[PDB]
Amino acid sequence: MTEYKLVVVGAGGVGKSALTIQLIQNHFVDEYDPTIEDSYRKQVVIDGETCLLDILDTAGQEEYSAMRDQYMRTGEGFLCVFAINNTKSFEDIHHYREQIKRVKDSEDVPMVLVGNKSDLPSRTVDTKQAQDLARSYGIPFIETSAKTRQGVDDAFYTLVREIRKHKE
Ligand SMILES: Nc1nc2c(ncn2[C@@H]2O[C@H](COP(=O)(O)OP(=O)(O)O)[C@@H](O)[C@H]2O)c(=O)[nH]1
Ligand SMILES: *S(=O)(=O)c1cccc(S(=O)(=O)Nc2ccncc2)c1
Ligand SMILES: [Mg+2]
Numbered sequence: 001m002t003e004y005k006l007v008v009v010g011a012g013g014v015g016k017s018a019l020t021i022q023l024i025q026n027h028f029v030d031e032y033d034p035t036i037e038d039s040y041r042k043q044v045v046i047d048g049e050t051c052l053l054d055i056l057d058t059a060g061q062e063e064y065s066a067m068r069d070q071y072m073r074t075g076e077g078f079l080c081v082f083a084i085n086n087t088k089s090f091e092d093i094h095h096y097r098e099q100i101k102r103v104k105d106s107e108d109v110p111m112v113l114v115g116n117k118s119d120l121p122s123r124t125v126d127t128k129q130a131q132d133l134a135r136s137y138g139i140p141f142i143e144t145s146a147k148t149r150q151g152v153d154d155a156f157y158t159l160v161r162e163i164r165k166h167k168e
Helices: 016-025 066-074 087-091 093-104 127-137 152-167
Strands: 002-009 038-046 049-057 077-083 111-116 141-143
Touching (some): 002 093, 016 049, 016 077, 038 152, 049 152, 066 093, 077 152
Parallel strands (some): 002 049, 077 111, 111 141
Antiparallel strands (some): 038 049
């Protein structure tokens, strides 16, 4: 079956681990060591076809590591995550997108902008702001909650579909 290599990037605290663990293991985890980088694996059916997802969940201290570099070079698509209640994490999005463009040496990189923690009412980033940013990057914007599962499959499977079209 076809395999897809996905990488979840964004500032610490935005919910990368929670989004990934929710997708892979179907549980919301409120206390996951922010310093753990790990790859996760799941067999899923997307548009009728069984796929294997391999997902790197990133920790900040590994950002410039050689081993991170190898995963980024081979990564086929990227979720750029911020939290809708944290303006700083939204401000940081360009940093992650820039790193991806550089490592892939490409303007044609499958990516989705993810606004996580949509269940929280203390919003500080507007959907219109993120949609504008996503449009400027040529990518979709998907709202998620790792807590309620809102949008979680949609974010990952949208990225997969983008990789699939990029390859095929
Ligand atoms: N309410 C809510 N909390 C979340 C969500 N995603 C993550 N969190 C919480 O935010 C904190 C940081 O999440 P974590 O996954 O460790 O972020 P990471 O540093 O990007 O891996 C934890 O307390 C999580 O439970 C979400 O969608 N909603
Ligand atoms: S790592 O130990 O090299 C590793 C663990 C699991 C899966 C892989 S990979 O699918 O070969 N590469 C990859 C790249 C980017 N994101 C996820 C997985 C590597
Ligand atoms: Mg984490």
